[PDB]
C-alpha cells in the first residue's frame, strides 16, 4: 500500500536575537516569538506579529516581575 | 405595604426575633416574575402576546431573555429569545405585593396551596402561579393562550426561620 503521512512545514527561525547585557540601537529586534512569551518594558515596543523591538539606544535587560510572574524585556539608556 | 412596614413591621419583628442591631431586620429586596415561552420558534407570536399581557399586569417594559448554547434534544439555540422576565424593586414591587395579596389569593382555586416548605434556605422564596388569570386585566377574550409564571422574592433574611417570620409579618397566606 502506501502511507498517508509525509508532510511538514518550512522552518520559521524563531527565538531570542539579542541577549542580556548586549548593546542595541533603536529598531533592533530582540525577540521573535509566536506568542507573548516575553512582554515589553520601558523603551520596548511590540509589533503586530508579537515581535519585540527596541525604541531607544541602550543595554538590554531581562527580568521577572508582577503578580502573574511573567517575563519582561527592557532597554536601559 | 408602603409605609406601614417602615413604621411598625421592623419594630415588631425585632421585638419577636431579638436581633441586636437595627440593620439586621430582614428586608424584602426584590421580586422577579419570569416565564419561558417554550418552542417559541414554532409560532413566533406567542412571545409577542406574552410580553403585552405581562406588561398589562406589571407596569414595566420587559426585557426578552436570550439563550446561550444550543441543546440537541430541544429546538433552542443561542441566537433567538426563549423567555421573558421583569424585576421589581421599591414602589413597584410593594404595590405589586399589595395587589397580589389583595386579589390573587381569592381568585386562586385552592386556598393555602402555598407551602411553608420549598424555601431556598437562604431567605428567598420561590412560587409558581398557574395561568395568567387571577390577575387584574381583560377577560379571556382579546387574550391569547393561558400561561403560567414564576415569582421569586429575594430578601435579606439570613436564615429560613427569619424569612418565614418576615412572610408571617407581611401577611402571606402560607
Amino acid at each position: 500500500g502506501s502511507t498517508k503521512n509525509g508532510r511538514d512545514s518550512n522552518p520559521k527561525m524563531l527565538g531570542v536575537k539579542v541577549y542580556g547585557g548586549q548593546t542595541v540601537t533603536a529598531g533592533n529586534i530582540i525577540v521573535r516569538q509566536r506568542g507573548t512569551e516575553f512582554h515589553a518594558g520601558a523603551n520596548v515596543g511590540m509589533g503586530r506579529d508579537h515581535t519585540l523591538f527596541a525604541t531607544a539606544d541602550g543595554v538590554v535587560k531581562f527580568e521577572v516581575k508582577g503578580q502573574f510572574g511573567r517575563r519582561y524585556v527592557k532597554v536601559e539608556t | 405595604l408602603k409605609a406601614r412596614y417602615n413604621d411598625e413591621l421592623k419594630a415588631k419583628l425585632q421585638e419577636e426575633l431579638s436581633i441586636k442591631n437595627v440593620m439586621e431586620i430582614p428586608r424584602i429586596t426584590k421580586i422577579t416574575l419570569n416565564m419561558g415561552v417554550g418552542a417559541a420558534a414554532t409560532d413566533k407570536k406567542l412571545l409577542d402576546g406574552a410580553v403585552a399581557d405581562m406588561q398589562l399586569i406589571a407596569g414595566q417594559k420587559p426585557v426578552v431573555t436570550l439563550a446561550r448554547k444550543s441543546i440537541a434534544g430541544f429546538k433552542i439555540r443561542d441566537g433567538w429569545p426563549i423567555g421573558c422576565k421583569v424585576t421589581l424593586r421599591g414602589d413597584q414591587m410593594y404595590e405589586f405585593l399589595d395587589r397580589l395579596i389583595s386579589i390573587a389569593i381569592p381568585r386562586i382555586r385552592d386556598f393555602r396551596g402555598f407551602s411553608a416548605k420549598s424555601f431556598d434556605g437562604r431567605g428567598n422564596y420561590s412560587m409558581g402561579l398557574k395561568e395568567q388569570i387571577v390577575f387584574p386585566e381583560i377577560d379571556f377574550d382579546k387574550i391569547d393562550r393561558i400561561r403560567g409564571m414564576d415569582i421569586t422574592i429575594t430578601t435579606t433574611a439570613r436564615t429560613d426561620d427569619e424569612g418565614r417570620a418576615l412572610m408571617r409579618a407581611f401577611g402571606f397566606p402560607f
Binding site: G1, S2, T3, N5 | -
Partner: protein, 137 residues
Amino acid sequence: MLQPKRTKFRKVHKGRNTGLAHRGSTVSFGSIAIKATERGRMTARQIEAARRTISRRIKRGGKIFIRVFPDKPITEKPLEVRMGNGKGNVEYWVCEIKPGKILYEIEGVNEDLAREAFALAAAKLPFKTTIVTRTVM
C-alpha cells in the same frame, strides 16, 4: 491478556532501556514479593502464564497483586516484504522491566508455599529473579 482500553497514539518509538528502578522496588501491597534483578522486556502472555502458575500452585488460598502492566505497543512487518513503505502494524504489547522492579506480591499465604510458587514462576520468565519480604525501613 492485559492491554490498554484506549490509546492516544497507535505506534511508538523504540527508545532505549537504561537506569535502575528506584520506584516500584518496595513491597507495599503484600507480604512476600518476587523482584527482577536485571533488565528486559516482559510480554502479556508471559505475565499471564506466571500468574496462572502461581495461582494454581497456591490453590487460591491468598491474594496475588500484579504490579506490571503492558502499555507499550510493538510492531513487526508482516513477512516477505522489502524495507520501506511505512511502519508496521501492532502484534503484541509489552512492559519494560528495570533491575529492582517488583513483579508479583503475595499476601495471606505461608512463606514456604509462596517461595515455592515463585520458584515455579521463575522458570517461565526471561530474566533473573529474587525474593523479598516486607520490612520496616
